PDB file of C-alpha atoms in Angstrom:
ATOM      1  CA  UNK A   1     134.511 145.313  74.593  1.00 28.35           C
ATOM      2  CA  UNK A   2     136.083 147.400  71.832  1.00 26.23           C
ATOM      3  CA  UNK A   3     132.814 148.828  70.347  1.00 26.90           C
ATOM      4  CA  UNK A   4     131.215 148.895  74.504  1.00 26.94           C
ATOM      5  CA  UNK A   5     128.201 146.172  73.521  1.00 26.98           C
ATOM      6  CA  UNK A   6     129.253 143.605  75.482  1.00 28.40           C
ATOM      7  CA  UNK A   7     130.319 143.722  78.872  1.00 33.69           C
ATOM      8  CA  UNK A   8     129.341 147.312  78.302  1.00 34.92           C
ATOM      9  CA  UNK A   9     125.875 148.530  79.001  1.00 37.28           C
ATOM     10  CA  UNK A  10     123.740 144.741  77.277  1.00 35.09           C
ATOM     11  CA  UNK A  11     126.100 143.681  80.454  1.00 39.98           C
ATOM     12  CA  UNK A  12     125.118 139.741  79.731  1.00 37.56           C
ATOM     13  CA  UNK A  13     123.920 137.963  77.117  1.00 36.75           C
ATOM     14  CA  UNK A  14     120.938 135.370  76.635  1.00 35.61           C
ATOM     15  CA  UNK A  15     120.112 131.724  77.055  1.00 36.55           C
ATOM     16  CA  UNK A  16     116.995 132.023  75.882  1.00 37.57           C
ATOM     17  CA  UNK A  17     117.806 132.714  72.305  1.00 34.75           C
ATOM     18  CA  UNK A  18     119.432 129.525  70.018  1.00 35.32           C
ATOM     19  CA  UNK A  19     118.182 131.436  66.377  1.00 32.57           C
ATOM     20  CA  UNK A  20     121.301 132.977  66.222  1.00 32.93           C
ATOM     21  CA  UNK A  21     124.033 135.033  67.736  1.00 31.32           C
ATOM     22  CA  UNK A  22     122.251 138.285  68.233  1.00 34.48           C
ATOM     23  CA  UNK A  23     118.855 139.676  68.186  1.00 32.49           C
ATOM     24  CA  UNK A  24     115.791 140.700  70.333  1.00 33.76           C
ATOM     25  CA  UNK A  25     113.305 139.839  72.899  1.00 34.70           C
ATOM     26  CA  UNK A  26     110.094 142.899  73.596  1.00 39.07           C
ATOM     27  CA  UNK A  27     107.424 143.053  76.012  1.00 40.90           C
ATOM     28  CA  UNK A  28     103.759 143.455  74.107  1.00 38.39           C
ATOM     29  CA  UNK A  29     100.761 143.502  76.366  1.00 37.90           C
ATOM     30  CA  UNK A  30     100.259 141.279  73.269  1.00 39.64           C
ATOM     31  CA  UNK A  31     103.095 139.324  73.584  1.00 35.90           C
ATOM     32  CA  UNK A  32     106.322 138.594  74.714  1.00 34.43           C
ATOM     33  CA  UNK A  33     109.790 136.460  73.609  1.00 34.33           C
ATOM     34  CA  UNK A  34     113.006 135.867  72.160  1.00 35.24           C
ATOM     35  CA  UNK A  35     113.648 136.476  68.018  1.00 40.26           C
ATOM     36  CA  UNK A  36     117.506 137.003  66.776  1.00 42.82           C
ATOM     37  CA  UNK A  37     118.036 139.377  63.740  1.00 44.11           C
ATOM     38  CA  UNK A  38     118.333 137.294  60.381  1.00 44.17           C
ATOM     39  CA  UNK A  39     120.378 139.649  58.170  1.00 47.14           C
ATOM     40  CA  UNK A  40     123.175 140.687  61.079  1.00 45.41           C
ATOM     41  CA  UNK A  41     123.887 137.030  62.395  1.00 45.23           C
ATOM     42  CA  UNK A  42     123.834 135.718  58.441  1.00 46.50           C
ATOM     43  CA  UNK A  43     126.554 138.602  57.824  1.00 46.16           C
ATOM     44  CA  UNK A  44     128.683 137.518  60.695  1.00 47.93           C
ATOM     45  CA  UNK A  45     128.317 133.687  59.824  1.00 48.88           C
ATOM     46  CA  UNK A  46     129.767 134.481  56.493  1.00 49.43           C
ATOM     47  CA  UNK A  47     132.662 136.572  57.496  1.00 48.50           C
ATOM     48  CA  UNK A  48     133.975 134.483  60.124  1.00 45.94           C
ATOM     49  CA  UNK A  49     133.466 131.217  57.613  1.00 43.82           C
ATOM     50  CA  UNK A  50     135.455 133.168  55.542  1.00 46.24           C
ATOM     51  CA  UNK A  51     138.191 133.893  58.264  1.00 47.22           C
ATOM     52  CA  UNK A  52     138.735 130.405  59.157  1.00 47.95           C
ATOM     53  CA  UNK A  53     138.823 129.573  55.176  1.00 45.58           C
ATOM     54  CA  UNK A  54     141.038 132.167  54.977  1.00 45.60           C
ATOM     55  CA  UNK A  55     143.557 131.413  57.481  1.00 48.05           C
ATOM     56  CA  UNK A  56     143.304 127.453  57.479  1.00 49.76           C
ATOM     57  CA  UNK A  57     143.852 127.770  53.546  1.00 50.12           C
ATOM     58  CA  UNK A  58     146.914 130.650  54.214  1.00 52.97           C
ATOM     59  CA  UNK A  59     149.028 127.394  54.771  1.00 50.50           C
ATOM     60  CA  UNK A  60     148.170 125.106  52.423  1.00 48.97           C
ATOM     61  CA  UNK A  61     151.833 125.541  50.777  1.00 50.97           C
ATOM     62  CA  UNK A  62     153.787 125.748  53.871  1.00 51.02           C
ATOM     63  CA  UNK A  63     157.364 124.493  54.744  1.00 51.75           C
ATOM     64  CA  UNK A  64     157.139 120.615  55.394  1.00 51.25           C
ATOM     65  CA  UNK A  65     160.624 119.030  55.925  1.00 53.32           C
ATOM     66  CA  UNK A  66     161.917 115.211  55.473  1.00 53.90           C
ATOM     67  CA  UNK A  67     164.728 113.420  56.606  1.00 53.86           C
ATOM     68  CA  UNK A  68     168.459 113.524  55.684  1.00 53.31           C
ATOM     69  CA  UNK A  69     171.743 111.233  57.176  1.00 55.10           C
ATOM     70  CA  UNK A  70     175.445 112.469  57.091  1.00 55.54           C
ATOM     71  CA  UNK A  71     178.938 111.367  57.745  1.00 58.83           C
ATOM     72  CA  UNK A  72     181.050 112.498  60.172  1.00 57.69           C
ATOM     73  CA  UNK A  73     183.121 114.969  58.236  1.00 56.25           C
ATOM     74  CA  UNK A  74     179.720 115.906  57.081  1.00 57.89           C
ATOM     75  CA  UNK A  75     178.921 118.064  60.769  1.00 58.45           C
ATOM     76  CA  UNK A  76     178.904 121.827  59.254  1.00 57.88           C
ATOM     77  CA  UNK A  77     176.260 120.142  56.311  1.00 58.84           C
ATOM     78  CA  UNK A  78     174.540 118.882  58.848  1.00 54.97           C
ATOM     79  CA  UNK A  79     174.475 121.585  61.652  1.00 56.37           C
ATOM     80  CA  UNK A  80     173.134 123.849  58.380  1.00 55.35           C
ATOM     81  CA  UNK A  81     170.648 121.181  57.738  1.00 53.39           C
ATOM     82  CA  UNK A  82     169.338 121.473  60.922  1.00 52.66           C
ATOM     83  CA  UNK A  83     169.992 125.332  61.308  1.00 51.47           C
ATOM     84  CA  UNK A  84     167.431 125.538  58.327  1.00 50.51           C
ATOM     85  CA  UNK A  85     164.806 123.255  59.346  1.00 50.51           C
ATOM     86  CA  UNK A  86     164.460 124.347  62.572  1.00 48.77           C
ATOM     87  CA  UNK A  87     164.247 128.206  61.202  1.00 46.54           C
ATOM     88  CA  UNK A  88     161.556 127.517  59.285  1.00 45.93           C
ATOM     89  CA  UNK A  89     159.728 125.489  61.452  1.00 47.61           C
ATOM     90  CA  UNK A  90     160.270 128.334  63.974  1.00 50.68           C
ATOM     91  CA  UNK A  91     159.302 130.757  61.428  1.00 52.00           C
ATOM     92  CA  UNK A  92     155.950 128.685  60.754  1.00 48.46           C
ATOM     93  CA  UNK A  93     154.898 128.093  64.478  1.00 47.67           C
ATOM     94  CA  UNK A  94     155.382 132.137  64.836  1.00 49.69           C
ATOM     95  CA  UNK A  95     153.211 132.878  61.633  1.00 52.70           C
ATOM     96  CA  UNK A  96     150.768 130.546  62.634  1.00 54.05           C
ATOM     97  CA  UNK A  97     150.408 131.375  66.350  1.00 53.49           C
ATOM     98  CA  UNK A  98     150.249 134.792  66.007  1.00 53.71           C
ATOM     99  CA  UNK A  99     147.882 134.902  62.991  1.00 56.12           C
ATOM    100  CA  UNK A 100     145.343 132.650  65.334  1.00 55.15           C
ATOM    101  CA  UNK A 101     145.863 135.525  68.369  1.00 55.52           C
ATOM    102  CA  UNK A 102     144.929 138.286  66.112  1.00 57.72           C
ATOM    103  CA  UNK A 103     142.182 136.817  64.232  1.00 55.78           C
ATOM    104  CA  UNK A 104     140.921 136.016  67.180  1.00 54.46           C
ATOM    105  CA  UNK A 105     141.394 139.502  68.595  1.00 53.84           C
ATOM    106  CA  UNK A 106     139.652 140.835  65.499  1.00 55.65           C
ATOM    107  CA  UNK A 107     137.145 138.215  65.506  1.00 57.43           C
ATOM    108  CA  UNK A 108     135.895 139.304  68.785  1.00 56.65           C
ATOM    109  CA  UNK A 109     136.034 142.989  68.784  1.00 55.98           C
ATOM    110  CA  UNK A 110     133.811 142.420  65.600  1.00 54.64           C
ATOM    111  CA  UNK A 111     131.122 140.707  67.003  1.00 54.93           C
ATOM    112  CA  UNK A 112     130.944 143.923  69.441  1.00 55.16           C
ATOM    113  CA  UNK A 113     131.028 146.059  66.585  1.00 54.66           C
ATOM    114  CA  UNK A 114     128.193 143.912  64.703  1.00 52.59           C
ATOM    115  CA  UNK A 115     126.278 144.670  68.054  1.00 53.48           C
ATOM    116  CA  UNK A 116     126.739 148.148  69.030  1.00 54.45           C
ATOM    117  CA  UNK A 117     126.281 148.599  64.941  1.00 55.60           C
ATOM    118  CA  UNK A 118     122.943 146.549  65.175  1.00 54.81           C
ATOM    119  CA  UNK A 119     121.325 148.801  68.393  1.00 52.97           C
ATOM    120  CA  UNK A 120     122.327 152.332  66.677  1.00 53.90           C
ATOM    121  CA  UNK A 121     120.682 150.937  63.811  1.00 50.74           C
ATOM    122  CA  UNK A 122     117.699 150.805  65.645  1.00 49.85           C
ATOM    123  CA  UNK A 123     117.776 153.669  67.699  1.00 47.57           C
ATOM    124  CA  UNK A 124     118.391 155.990  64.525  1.00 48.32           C
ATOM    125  CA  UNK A 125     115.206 154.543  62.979  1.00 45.86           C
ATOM    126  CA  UNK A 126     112.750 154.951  66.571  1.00 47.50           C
ATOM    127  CA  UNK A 127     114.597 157.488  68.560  1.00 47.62           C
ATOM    128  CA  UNK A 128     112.002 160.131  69.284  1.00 45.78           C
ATOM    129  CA  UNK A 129     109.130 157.413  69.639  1.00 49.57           C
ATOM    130  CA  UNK A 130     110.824 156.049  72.525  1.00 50.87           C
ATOM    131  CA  UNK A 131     113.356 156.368  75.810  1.00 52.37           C
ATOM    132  CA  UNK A 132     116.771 154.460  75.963  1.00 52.45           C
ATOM    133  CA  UNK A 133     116.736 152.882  79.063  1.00 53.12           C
ATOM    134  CA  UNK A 134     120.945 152.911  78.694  1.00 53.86           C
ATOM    135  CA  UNK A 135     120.696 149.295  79.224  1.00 56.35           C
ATOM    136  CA  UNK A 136     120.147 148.434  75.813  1.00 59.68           C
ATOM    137  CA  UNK A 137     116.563 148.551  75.802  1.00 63.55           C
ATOM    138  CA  UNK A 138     114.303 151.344  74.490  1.00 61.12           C
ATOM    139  CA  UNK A 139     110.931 151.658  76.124  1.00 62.06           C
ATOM    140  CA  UNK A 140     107.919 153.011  74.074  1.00 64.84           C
ATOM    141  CA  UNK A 141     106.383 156.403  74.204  1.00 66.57           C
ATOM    142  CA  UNK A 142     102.980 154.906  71.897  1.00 65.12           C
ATOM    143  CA  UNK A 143     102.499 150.942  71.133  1.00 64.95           C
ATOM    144  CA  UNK A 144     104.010 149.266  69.007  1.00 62.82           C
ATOM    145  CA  UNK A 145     101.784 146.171  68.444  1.00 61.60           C
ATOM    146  CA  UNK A 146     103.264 142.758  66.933  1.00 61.92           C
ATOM    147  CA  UNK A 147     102.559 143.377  63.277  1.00 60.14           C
ATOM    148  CA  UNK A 148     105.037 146.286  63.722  1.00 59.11           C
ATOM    149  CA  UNK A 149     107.842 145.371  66.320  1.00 59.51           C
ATOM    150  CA  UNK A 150     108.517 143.015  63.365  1.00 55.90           C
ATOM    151  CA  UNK A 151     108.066 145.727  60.916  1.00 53.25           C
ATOM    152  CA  UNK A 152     111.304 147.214  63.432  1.00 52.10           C
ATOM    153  CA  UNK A 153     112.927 143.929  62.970  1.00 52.73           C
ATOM    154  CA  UNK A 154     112.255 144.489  58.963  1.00 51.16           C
ATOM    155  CA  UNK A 155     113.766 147.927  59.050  1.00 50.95           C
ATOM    156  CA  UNK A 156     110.585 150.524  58.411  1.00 49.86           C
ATOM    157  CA  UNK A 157     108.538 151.044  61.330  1.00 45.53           C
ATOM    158  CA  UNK A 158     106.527 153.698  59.993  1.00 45.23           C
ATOM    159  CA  UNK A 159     108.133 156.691  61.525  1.00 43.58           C
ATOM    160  CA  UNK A 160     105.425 159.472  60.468  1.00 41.24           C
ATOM    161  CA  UNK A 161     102.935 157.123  61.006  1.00 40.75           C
ATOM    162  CA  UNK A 162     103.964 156.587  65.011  1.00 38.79           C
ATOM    163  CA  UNK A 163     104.673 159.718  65.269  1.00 41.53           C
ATOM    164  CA  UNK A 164     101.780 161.889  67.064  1.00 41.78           C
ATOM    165  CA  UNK A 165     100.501 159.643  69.793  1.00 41.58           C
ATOM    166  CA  UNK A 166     103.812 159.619  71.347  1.00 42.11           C
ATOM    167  CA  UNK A 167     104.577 163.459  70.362  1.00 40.61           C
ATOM    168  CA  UNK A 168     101.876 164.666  72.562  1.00 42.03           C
ATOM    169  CA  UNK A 169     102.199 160.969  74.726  1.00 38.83           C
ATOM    170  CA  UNK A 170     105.743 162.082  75.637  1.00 41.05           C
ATOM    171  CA  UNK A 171     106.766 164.847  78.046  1.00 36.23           C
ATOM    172  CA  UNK A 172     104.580 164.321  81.396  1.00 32.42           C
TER     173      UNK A 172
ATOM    174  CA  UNK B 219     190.969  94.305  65.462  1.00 31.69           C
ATOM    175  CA  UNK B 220     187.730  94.453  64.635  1.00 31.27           C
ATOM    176  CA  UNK B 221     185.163  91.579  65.212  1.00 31.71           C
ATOM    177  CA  UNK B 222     188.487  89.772  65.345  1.00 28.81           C
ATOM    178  CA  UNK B 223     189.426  91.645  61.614  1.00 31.90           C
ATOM    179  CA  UNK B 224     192.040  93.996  61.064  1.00 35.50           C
ATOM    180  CA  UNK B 225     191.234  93.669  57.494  1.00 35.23           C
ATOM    181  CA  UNK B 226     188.837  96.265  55.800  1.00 37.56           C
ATOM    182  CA  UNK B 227     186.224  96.384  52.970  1.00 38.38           C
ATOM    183  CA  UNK B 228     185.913  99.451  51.198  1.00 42.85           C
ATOM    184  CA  UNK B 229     182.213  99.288  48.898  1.00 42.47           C
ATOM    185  CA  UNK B 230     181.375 101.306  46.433  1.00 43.09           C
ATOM    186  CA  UNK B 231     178.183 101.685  44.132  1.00 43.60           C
ATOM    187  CA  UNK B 232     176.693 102.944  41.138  1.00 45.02           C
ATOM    188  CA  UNK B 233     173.544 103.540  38.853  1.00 45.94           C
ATOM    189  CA  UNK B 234     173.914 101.707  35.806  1.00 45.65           C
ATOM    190  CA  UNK B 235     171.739 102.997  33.218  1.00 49.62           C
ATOM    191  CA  UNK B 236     169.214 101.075  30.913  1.00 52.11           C
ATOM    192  CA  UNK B 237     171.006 100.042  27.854  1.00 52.39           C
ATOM    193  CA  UNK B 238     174.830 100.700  29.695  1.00 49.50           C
ATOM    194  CA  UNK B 239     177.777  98.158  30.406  1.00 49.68           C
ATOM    195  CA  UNK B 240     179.706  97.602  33.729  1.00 54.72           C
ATOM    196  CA  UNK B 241     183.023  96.103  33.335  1.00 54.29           C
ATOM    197  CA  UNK B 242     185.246  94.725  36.108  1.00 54.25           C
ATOM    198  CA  UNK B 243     188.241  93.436  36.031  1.00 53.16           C
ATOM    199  CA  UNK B 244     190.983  92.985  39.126  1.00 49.82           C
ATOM    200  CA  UNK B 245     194.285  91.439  39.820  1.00 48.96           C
ATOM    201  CA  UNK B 246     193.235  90.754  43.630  1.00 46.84           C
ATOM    202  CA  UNK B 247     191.256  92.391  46.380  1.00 43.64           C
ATOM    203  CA  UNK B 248     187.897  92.550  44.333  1.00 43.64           C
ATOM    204  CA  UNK B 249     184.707  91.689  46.325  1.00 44.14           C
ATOM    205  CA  UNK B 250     182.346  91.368  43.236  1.00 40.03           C
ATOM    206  CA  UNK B 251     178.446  91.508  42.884  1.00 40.05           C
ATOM    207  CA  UNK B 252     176.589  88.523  42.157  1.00 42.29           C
ATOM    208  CA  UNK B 253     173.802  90.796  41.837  1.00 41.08           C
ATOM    209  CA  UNK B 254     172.076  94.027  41.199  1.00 45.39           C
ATOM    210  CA  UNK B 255     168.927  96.147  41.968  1.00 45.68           C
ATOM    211  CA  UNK B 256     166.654  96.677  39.338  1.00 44.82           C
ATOM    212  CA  UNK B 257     164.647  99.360  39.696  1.00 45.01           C
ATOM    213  CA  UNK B 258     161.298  98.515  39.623  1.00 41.19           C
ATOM    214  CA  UNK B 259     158.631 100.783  41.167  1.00 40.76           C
ATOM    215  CA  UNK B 260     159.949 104.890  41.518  1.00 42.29           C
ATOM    216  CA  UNK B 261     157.862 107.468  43.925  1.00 41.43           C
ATOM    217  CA  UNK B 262     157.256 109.730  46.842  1.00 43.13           C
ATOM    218  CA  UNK B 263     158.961 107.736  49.704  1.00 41.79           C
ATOM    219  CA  UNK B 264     161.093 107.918  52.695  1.00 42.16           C
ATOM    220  CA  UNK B 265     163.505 105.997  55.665  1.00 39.25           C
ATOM    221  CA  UNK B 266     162.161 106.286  58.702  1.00 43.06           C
ATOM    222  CA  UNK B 267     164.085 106.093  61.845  1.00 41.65           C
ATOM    223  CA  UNK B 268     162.149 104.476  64.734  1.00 41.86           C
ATOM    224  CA  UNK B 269     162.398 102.039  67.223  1.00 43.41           C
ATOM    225  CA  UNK B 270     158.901 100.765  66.617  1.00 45.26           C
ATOM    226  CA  UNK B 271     157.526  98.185  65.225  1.00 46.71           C
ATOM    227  CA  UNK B 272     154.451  96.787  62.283  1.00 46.87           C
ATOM    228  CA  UNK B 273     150.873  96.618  63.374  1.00 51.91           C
TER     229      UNK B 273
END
């Protein structure tokens, strides 16, 4: 995409996750399976609600046109008549159109963004604990148990803490 | 002629407010009113050209 996440190097997307529209799945010796970020998806819910809010509601006024007859020495009030509500309605079906292809645009490219956004956001907190795989995956240089993969999820994994075992665990 | 008339009738109309007169009088070639249109309920409307039909 814009921001590279998808159909960059996460390549494909999964199934096996319904909790929301992004997130993460690990492999513990402990355990193993699919959990989608809270925060990040909630964010993205909202701001798209409020793009279809936004647009839907940017015609609420908009030009709406009814009826008229005239004689037959009428023709200019009439061809100007129809001049003008044709214009507008041209002028409308533009707006409208292109407002839906841009939004759209935007819409996507921002999902990518909340993505890529979402795995730096990670990787800045972990990075020396562990290898990207350039996949979108980071492997572990220590264990990370399940109390705190979800303490990654949370946003403190106890950097310090981690640290050691895969200081001296690392190189080889 | 036309349906068989080579005659005409011009019509004309008005709005005759609450309250106001209308006087006619002619020496020949008056078509009068035996009626009028009140006015009776005003609003949001329209004439709608179509070859359709009520359902």
């Amino acid at each position: 995409g814009l921001f590279g996440a998808i159909a960059g190097f996460i390549e494909g997307g999964w199934q096996g996750m319904v909790d929301g529209w992004y997130g993460y799945h690990h492999s513990n010796d402990q355990g193993s399976g699919y959990a989608a970020d809270k925060e990040s998806t909630q964010k993205a819910f909202d701001g798209i609600t409020n793009k279809v809010n936004s647009v839907i509601e940017k015609m609420n006024t908009q030009f709406e046109a009814v009826g008229k007859e005239f004689s037959n020495l009428e023709r200019r009030l009439e061809n100007l008549n129809k001049k003008m509500e044709d214009g507008f309605l041209d002028v409308w079906t533009y707006n409208a159109e292109l407002l839906v292809l841009m939004e759209n645009e935007r819409t996507l490219d921002f999902h990518d963004s909340n993505v890529k956004n979402l795995y730096d956001k990670v990787r800045m907190q972990l990075r020396d604990n562990v290898k990207e795989l350039g996949n979108g995956c980071f492997e572990f240089y220590h264990k990370c148990d399940d109390e705190c993969m979800n303490s990654v999820k949370n946003g403190t994994y106890d950097y310090p803490k981690y640290e050691e075992e895969s200081k001296l665990n690392r190189n080889e | 002629k036309v349906n068989g008339q080579g005659g005409r009738m011009e019509f004309s109309w008005t709005l005759l407010d609450m309250w106001d007169t209308i006087n006619f009088e002619s020496t020949g070639n008056l078509i009068a009113p035996e009626y009028g249109f009140k006015i009776s309920k005003r609003g949001s409307s329209g004439i709608m050209k179509t070859e359709g039909t009520l359902e």
